[PDB]
Amino acid sequence: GSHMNNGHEEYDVIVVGGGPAGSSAAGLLALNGHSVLLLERDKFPRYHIGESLITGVLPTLARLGLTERMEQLGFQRKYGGSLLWGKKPWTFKFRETGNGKYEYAYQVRRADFDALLLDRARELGVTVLEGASVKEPLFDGDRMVGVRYSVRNEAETVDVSGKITIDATGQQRWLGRHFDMVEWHEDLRNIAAWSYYQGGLRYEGETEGNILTENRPHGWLWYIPLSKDITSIGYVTPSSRLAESGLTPEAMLDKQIAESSEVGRLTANARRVDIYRTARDWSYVCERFSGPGYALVGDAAAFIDPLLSTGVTLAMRGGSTVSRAVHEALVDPAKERDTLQTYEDSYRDFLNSLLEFVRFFYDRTKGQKDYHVGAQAIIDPDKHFPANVDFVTLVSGLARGDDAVDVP
């Protein structure tokens, strides 16, 4: 006898996870004519934190045919950011780079955004399975050849074959855990506490949609307008600072909103309208982002920190670049490893510029001009462009010459 698989399936690509990284990777691979299975453990739409987008998402949204859908759904447009940071808020506009061609991104309720992308992946031909939890990879020697998954409330697991398996599991870090290959950023051990508020004030004109990021003595606040009526407000601090305080994360959030200058003003007539939520211990990079038969993308590969709101752009740039790499690997299997090593090189270049800048920006002793020159020092050391243009290029999640997030 044999372990036989009732209704056994085989796909070109298995994508594990249907957040922005997995749905973008899967949809773009289906657009390229491949057979794609996407396994998502939850039912969409499903709650997620991580709401402020930057203009680096726009090229992937365009490739997915979603530019007009973003406007139909009515997500809040975001023309730039407000920073009460360093030595009243200073601001930037997304139009300061790229000759003004990307004027705005969005603030999004993630359940709705992630469901738009997953529904679009299905429309493009992906077989999306919901309630499907990947348990372990399947191997032929070192090569990943498929996965084993469980369906909620069903006794029997399912084995499925795939020529390449993409780990898009976000902070669940499926393959980082499998291979014990997570490299933690031990200097970025932070905790976030957040809730939702009705009645917050809004800036005037185009600035209505701005994120506000406000520095505090030992942390910082975000203030994200999702709509005219709802604001996402969170406090981020090193876990050591919260622990030292003896306060709960929820009490600390309440204290920081009240004691802050700008968020305190903006919330004078506000009311909390949801539970408190927390997250911590999010900053790491995996040792490798591929191997024989597999690739990692989005937070499953790496995450920096919420300061400067880059994660969903890292994820969708990742989906765009991994879909191109995986397609080239399927067409020319002899070059699979080379193509996936190039994918990782490019990801690491983009990621590292943002990691170095986030670590720099965390020094709240500098001024606006210092932050601009810091961005220029990373992405434009020969000063082809003004420092304020370089700042906006970097914090927009764009990169010159990068086909997935090019400066327009």
Ligand X SMILES: Cc1cc2nc3c(=O)[nH]c(=O)nc-3n(C[C@H](O)[C@H](O)[C@H](O)COP(=O)(O)OP(=O)(O)OC[C@H]3O[C@@H](n4cnc5c(N)ncnc54)[C@H](O)[C@@H]3O)c2cc1C
User: What is the smallest separation between the CB atom of 312 and ligand X, expressed in angstroms?
Assistant: 3
Please, what is the Cα angle at 374 between 352 and 382, to 5 degrees?
A: 85
Is 110 part of any known ligand binding site?
yes
Q: Which residue has the tokens 């030595």?
A: 87
By rule CB under 6 A, what count of residues binds ligand X? 39
Q: How many CB atoms lie within 10 A of CB 154?
A: 10
Q: Which of these ranges, 43-51, 181-189, 246-254, 344-352, lies near ligand X under the rule CB under 6 A?
A: 43-51
Beta bridge partners of 134: 149
User: Quick one: which H or E segment has residue 230?
Assistant: strand 230-238
Q: Is residue 41 within the footprint of ligand X (CB under 6 A)?
A: yes
Q: Which is nearer to ligand X, 133 or 245 (CB)?
A: 133
Please, what is the Cα angle at 172 between 358 and 37, to 5 degrees?
A: 115
Distances (CA, A) of 171 to 16, 246, 338: 12, 27, 27
**Which one among 29, 37, 39, 128 touches ligand X, defined by CB under 6 A?**
39
Residue environment code for 209-218, b if the CB has 16+ CB neighbours within 10 A, otherwise e: bbbbbbbbee
**Which one among 298, 355, 380, 391 touches ligand X, defined by CB under 6 A?**
298
**Which one among 13, 14, 15, 16 touches ligand X, defined by CB under 6 A?**
16
Is 218 part of any known ligand binding site?
no
Q: Which is nearer to ligand X, 278 or 369 (CB)?
A: 278
User: What is the smallest separation between the CB atom of 129 and ligand X, expressed in angstroms?
Assistant: 9
Q: Give which of Cl ion, ligand X, none residue 353 binds (C-beta under 5 to 8 Å, depending on kind).
A: none
Q: Give which of ligand X, Cl ion, none residue 49 binds (C-beta under 5 to 8 Å, depending on kind).
A: ligand X
- Which strands, in side-by-side order, build the sheet including 284-286? 182-184, 284-286, 302-303
Window 296 to 355, contacts with Cl ion (CB under 5 A): 306, 310-311
Residue environment code for 379-392, b if the CB has 16+ CB neighbours within 10 A, otherwise e: bbeeeebebbbbbb
Please, what is the Cα angle at 211 between 206 and 212, to 5 degrees?
A: 110
User: What is the smallest separation between the CB atom of 42 and ligand X, expressed in angstroms?
Assistant: 4
Q: Is residue 170 within the footprint of ligand X (CB under 6 A)?
A: yes
Q: Which is nearer to ligand X, 168 or 242 (CB)?
A: 168
**Residue span 50-89 as binding mask against ligand X, x where in contact by CB under 6 A, dash where not:** xxxx------------------------------------
Cβ–Cβ < 8 Å for 166, 15: yes
Q: Give which of Cl ion, ligand X, none residue 161 binds (C-beta under 5 to 8 Å, depending on kind).
A: none
Distance (Å, whole) CA 51 – CA 110: 6
Distances (CA, A) of 331 to 64, 175, 326: 21, 24, 9
**Which one among 11, 13, 14, 17 touches ligand X, defined by CB under 6 A?**
17
Which residues lie closer than 8 Å to 186 by C-beta, 6 or more apart?
none
Window 303 to 332, contacts with ligand X (CB under 6 A): 303, 306, 309-313, 315
Q: DSSP letter at 96?
A: G
Q: Is residue 22 within the footprint of ligand X (CB under 6 A)?
A: yes
Q: Give which of Cl ion, ligand X, none residue 18 binds (C-beta under 5 to 8 Å, depending on kind).
A: ligand X
User: What is the smallest separation between the CB atom of 21 and ligand X, expressed in angstroms?
Assistant: 4
Q: Which is nearer to ligand X, 147 or 380 (CB)?
A: 147
**Residue span 113-142 as binding mask against ligand X, x where in contact by CB under 6 A, dash where not:** --------------------xx--------
Task: Look at strands 90-93 and 105-107 and give their pairing.
Answer: unpaired
Q: Which is nearer to ligand X, 251 or 387 (CB)?
A: 251
Distance (Å, whole) CA 321 – CA 62: 14
Q: Is residue 279 within the footprint of ligand X (CB under 6 A)?
A: yes
Q: Is residue 282 within the footprint of ligand X (CB under 6 A)?
A: yes
- Pinpoint the alpha helices (H) of 249-366: 249-259, 262-266, 311-331, 336-361
Sign of CA dihedral 198, 204, 207, 211: negative
Please, what is the Cα angle at 234 between 351 and 107, to 5 degrees?
A: 65
Binding site members: 40-41, 46, 48-49, 51-52, 110, 134, 299, 312
Binding-site annotation, residues for FAD: 40-41, 46, 48-49, 51-52, 110, 134, 299, 312
Binding site for Cl ion (CB under 5 A): 306, 310-311
Would you tell me which residues interact with ligand X (CB under 6 A)?
16-22, 39-42, 48-53, 133-134, 168-172, 174, 192, 234, 279, 282, 298-299, 303, 306, 309-313, 315
